[PDB]
Design a protein around this ligand. Structure first.
Ligand SMILES: O=C([O-])C(=O)[O-]
Ligand SMILES: O=C([O-])C(=O)[O-]
Ligand SMILES: [Mg+2]
Ligand SMILES: [Mg+2]
Lengths: 572, 572
């Protein structure tokens, strides 16, 4: 069993397949003698659904507050609705339906009626009822129940795939790692997982049919294997591997306070990519100099509804303050990739990653763009904040966004609300357009950050979440690495600088190149900070610059890798 | 009603709605009277299914021959198999399911049984079974079945969307045009419609909800308006609008033979993109000097099976010969973005346009690449052909494919099979990767054709299919133009040439820029040949260079549109 290394670590744990068992309704009519057993089946499965809910309601009386409780209390009501035991019981008795057939039809009726009124609030109950519907049915049906937030024991997730949203809400005290059939190194799912410090392997093809619930697994995400029901002998070897990983952390932690300077005096900034306030420890721990990218999406995901200016402002305030004196590049919201914000019901697209994403959504719905930009400016009252925009392709877009920034700024001035007047405004360069037009853009913004995840996806036209072509996904191709050069240069030509938060900035393989190409700031998963700090400290910039120039002249990846390879053999 | 004009023309006819209708199975047990009913309901639902295939089968021993007719003979056989009649009947009668729920089950049953055996041949029979399940189930549930190839009367098609294959199967004598909710100017479906000279308007809000089956429309794909049940004095205005349209042809016609030479002596080629020998007619009609892109996919969607070496050869030979002295640029096959061929049953992808497309397939399944290249080469013994590859992303890919050609060349040599030893090989530059490494690629090929539909798509990360963001799909961006220039220049630096088969070549607004930027070859829908020829014949080339240069420095489309306009004002 072998996939793509996604997020590092070794994990020892029982398998939990997130793959939910299908609701198979028994459709054979029942007999008069059965009528009692079936009533009791439903009453039994209900009490069991009502159980799980009481223990999700008390959980949300804590880890979510005292309002999240009411939400789940309202659910319990929907389940224990006397219109339901009414209709359901009558279906079993009067039409000899299975308790599961009955539940299925009473629920559907209940939900369908609720929508058939012209109400947004009743349109929500119908979803609630259908979701309570499932819980009940699956409880009646005997099927297992999987609670991502409320996992009980230390497990390793095995699924076909995982959404960043799903990955968000994962209980960390309990999930030790995950493995998926599909995905790729550079999915937002894999990316997130890196800052959750959660080991993950993703391109497995078919883990979901090589692994069964409760198989003991060692997710070796150092050497890219999973072992299913391993011998004690294998476990022990894997425990030595686990320990060896810790020794490295220890040796590498010696770099924590050291700056990222090359042997010849060239300093670059080494920052962390974050998603949430909590990722900041990771950052402190790994010697971050600040935050090169704050993916605000992960906020919008962290919840069940669209965060207000108020709540965002609280959240960006906390991150700023949690970064003490250190700066933060807050990127405005990038939803629409492989980043579902489900609670919105944006319609399906044939190509989400070539779709209505990030900047395109906010510009379609100023409401969304206004709250956010407002929330960030108001929060730049309490920290050194920069603003950055995802998914820029045109100068036109940048200009429009600046207008908005200036409009929100006035509104703030007008309402006696403080913001850092000197706030720097930058643009992601993650689009072959933005790279092509970089000279121009460098004139309109304060800085760049290269998103090599998207730039690669788009340059090479390969979907970053698509295992089948992943061998074509090559951020280290002459294609992408020359676009990267262009961007960096365009920036310096205008006295501006370029960061990188794409996963390449964290890849040991790229550091010398990136370094020699004039990259100004490396933002990465906190875990990758020390190792990259290491190569930077053991590198001579001027030699890196000569190397990067011959590597980028190479016509194929291997010819290019080769140059890098020889250099590293000669230097070591 | 308006959307995005896709294919020019004005059609008059009754609406034919294309039913999205998705099969809903009635799982609820039926009552005991409903039995004779549903039994017969199945048999007749099937009689219909059987009937509709019966025309399709005979239209096959005509348009193709006995071997492609026998395909459906088998389909019929699988449909009429009494092993499924018996099973279906049993579940209606004994287990009291609807005709559809039984039929759903028995189909799924037979299909999974076939897959369970480890036989490529039966996995194919599986698919057929499922294919014919669909038709059976749609007939059982009386959902309408429009066989695009056997449309009775002159209609105008109205549909959610329309896939290239679908468009391929349109009875050209009876469908006079179409209108869809979704789509883009540059979607392959749109493009095919141009060579069929089929007026089309895509990307309306909701023509589906606004047009009734059998409404009288005047689809005006000249001015971008659809009239629903037009007033007779509107039926008149339009009829006169159609007159102007016809005179426009008559006038443009006069250039049929004239070369594409600017006033000051600069010549370019101007050719037709084609799909099928049948398009050669339009090309000759519109003064094409050769074929700049022979989208071989289209030939593949002209059939219900993968065309073998021999079928391809014949098809290519015909084209080569229907082109007389003229050169055809045969592109190897490009399946897998918005152009699937259903008969391949490839699996779904999250982003087809960033997925396993074109060359990525032929390289993962050599039989496909081999048959085809074999066929092209052999056809080159019969007329001037060139080979060109789609979706090229790296120098790696090109070398691997040339190496492939060389192998296939020898085999032909060894089998006593002529091929043009002079045969030139080039590549689509339609990826920002390709554009970026254009210099490198130019050493490795004889020529380039820039696919701006794709290049635009990836450079801007905007899906050619996605109407919601169509406003961002701008091949006339400073970003795409720059990349165009960079490619042309690459060509010229090696002493090769670049053509263009993307829709920009045919776009009146790019013609002066494309020209000024030194593009050697334009290839388009045949219908665009005269407009562009006209523009070319009436420009001064030197002036265009100056224009091009200016345009390439603009950071904004608008600013670049201005140049173009002041030119047109001052210069003819
Ligand atoms: O957003 C990013 O970090 C990227 O696309 O690489
Ligand atoms: O294939 C093409 O011609 C394109 O993408 O423009
Ligand atoms: Mg990105
Ligand atoms: Mg193309």
């Amino acid at each position: 069993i072998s996939g793509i290394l996604a997020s590092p670590g070794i994990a020892f744990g029982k398998a939990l397949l997130l793959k939910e068992d299908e609701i198979v309704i028994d459709r054979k009519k029942i007999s008069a003698d059965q009528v009692d057993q079936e009533v009791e089946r439903f009453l039994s499965g209900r009490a069991k659904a009502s159980a799980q809910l009481e223990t999700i309601k008390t959980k949300a009386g804590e880890t979510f507050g005292e309002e999240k409780e009411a939400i789940f209390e309202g659910h319990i009501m929907l389940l224990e609705d006397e219109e339901l035991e009414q209709e359901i019981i009558a279906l079993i008795k009067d039409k000899h339906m299975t308790a599961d057939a009955a539940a299925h039809e009473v629920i559907e009726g209940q939900a369908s009626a609720l929508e058939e009124l012209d109400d947004e609030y009743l349109k929500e109950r119908a979803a609630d009822v259908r979701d309570i519907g499932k819980r009940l049915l699956r409880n009646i049906l005997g099927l297992k129940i999987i609670d991502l937030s409320a996992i009980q024991d230390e497990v390793i997730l095995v699924a076909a795939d995982l959404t960043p949203s799903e990955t968000a809400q994962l209980n960390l005290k309990k999930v030790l790692g995950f493995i998926t059939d599909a995905g790729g190194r550079t999915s937002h799912t894999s990316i997130m997982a890196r800052s959750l410090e959660l080991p993950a392997i993703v391109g497995t093809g078919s883990v979901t049919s090589q692994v069964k619930n409760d198989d003991y697994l060692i997710l070796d995400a150092v050497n890219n294997q999973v072992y299913v029901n391993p011998t004690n002998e294998v476990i022990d070897k894997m425990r030595a591997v686990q320990e060896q990983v810790a020794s490295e952390k220890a040796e590498l932690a010696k770099l924590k306070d050291l700056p990222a300077i090359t042997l010849d005096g060239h300093q670059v900034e080494v920052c962390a990519n974050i998603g949430t306030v909590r990722d900041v420890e990771g950052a402190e721990r790994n010697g971050a100099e600040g935050v090169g990218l704050y993916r605000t999406e992960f906020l919008f995901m962290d919840r069940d509804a669209l965060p207000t200016e108020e709540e965002q402002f609280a959240a960006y305030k906390a991150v700023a303050e949690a970064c003490g004196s250190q700066a933060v590049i807050v990127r405005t919201m990038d939803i629409g990739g492989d980043k579902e914000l489900p609670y919105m019901n944006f319609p399906k697209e044939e190509n989400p990653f070539l779709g209505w994403r990030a900047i395109r959504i906010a510009m379609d719905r100023r409401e969304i763009l206004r709250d956010q930009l407002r929330a960030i400016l108001r929060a730049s009252a309490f920290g050194k904040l920069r603003i950055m925009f995802p998914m820029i392709i045109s100068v036109e877009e940048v200009r429009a966004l600046r207008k908005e920034i200036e409009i929100y700024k006035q509104e703030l001035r007008d309402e006696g609300k403080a913001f850092d007047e000197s706030i720097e405004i930058g643009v992601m360069v993650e689009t072959p357009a933005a790279a092509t037009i970089a000279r121009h853009l460098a004139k309109e913004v304060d800085f760049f950050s290269i998103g090599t995840n998207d730039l690669t996806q788009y340059t090479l036209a390969v979907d970053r979440g698509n295992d089948m072509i992943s061998h074509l996904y090559q951020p280290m191709s002459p294609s992408v690495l020359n676009l990267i050069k262009q961007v960096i240069d365009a920036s310096h030509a205008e006295g501006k600088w370029t960061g990188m938060c794409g996963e390449l900035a964290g890849d040991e393989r790229a550091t010398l190149l990136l370094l020699g190409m004039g990259l100004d700031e490396f933002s990465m998963s906190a875990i990758s900070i020390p190792r990259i700090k290491k190569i930077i400290r053991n590198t001579n910039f001027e030699d890196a610059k000569v190397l990067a120039e011959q590597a980028l002249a190479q016509p194929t990846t291997d010819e290019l890798m080769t140059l890098v390879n020889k250099f590293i053999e000669e230097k070591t």
